[PDB]
Write a protein that binds this ligand. Sequence first.
Ligand SMILES: *[C@@H]1O[C@H](CO)[C@@H](O[C@@H]2O[C@H](CO)[C@@H](O)[C@H](O)[C@H]2NC(C)=O)[C@H](O)[C@H]1NC(C)=O
Ligand SMILES: *[C@@H]1O[C@H](CO)[C@@H](O)[C@H](O)[C@H]1NC(C)=O
Ligand SMILES: *[C@@H]1O[C@H](CO)[C@@H](O)[C@H](O)[C@H]1NC(C)=O
Lengths: 99, 108
Amino acid sequence: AARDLICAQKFNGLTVLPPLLTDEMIAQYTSALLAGTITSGWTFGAGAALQIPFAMQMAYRFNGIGVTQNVLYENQKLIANQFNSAIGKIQDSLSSTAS
Amino acid sequence: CGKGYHLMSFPQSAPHGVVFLHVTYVPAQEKNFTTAPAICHDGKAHFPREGVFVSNGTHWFVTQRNFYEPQIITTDNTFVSGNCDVVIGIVNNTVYDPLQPELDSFKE
Ligand SMILES: *[C@@H]1O[C@H](CO)[C@@H](O[C@@H]2O[C@H](CO)[C@@H](O)[C@H](O)[C@H]2NC(C)=O)[C@H](O)[C@H]1NC(C)=O
Ligand SMILES: *[C@@H]1O[C@H](CO)[C@@H](O)[C@H](O)[C@H]1NC(C)=O
Ligand SMILES: *[C@@H]1O[C@H](CO)[C@@H](O)[C@H](O)[C@H]1NC(C)=O
């Protein structure tokens, strides 16, 4: 085709170096963090990862706010459906708006 | 303030800087247990006050989260909220009442 801008930058002595960590390694780190925070809660960030069921972890996180844990166990389908709708809206917001 | 659960920190001087000695608490020796969210006893659902329900294989205890010491499931360390058909994962266990032995002894 024609002379690209990056070819002119390369010919004039300007170089871009690649990063040390590839995008696959960043994705592996992110997946490890997600798996730890889903399966073990906050315990993997303070020592050995200790497993806990997710409803019980969410009840602990409600006691961290000020709401007693009987609220979640008697409404678990409602929090589950609200979270599913809220995370489904993120995909619809990201598939259209580029700002 | 350091990795783990923070307890203390001590400063020290250094040329053009400071050095913090962070004293933290780390859990060490874990073991598996079977757990439940609530106890369905006498048509009522019991939830722990400050703790979690565990089983050593046959019996059910309530314990704190960051350390393992078990104790008997009691009305004093639990609370009641509704009936046991809404919570998913309930198990069946008796709940001790400390009032009743002294109450019946006063009754007789
Ligand atoms: C689970 O814990 C309970 C409470 O400590 C155990 O019950 C007691 O176990 C001791 C140890 O042999 C016995 O001497 C007692 O007679 C038991 N008491 C009762 C009321 O059973 C129980 O054995 C433990 N179960 C397992 C599988 O370790
Ligand atoms: C708990 O159970 C898992 C799977 O059964 C096993 O790999 C592990 O060694 C057990 N003990 C601890 C302390 O996690
Ligand atoms: C617990 O006890 C109730 C009646 O007291 C019974 O209907 C229920 O099936 C029991 N739960 C299990 C898991 O057996």
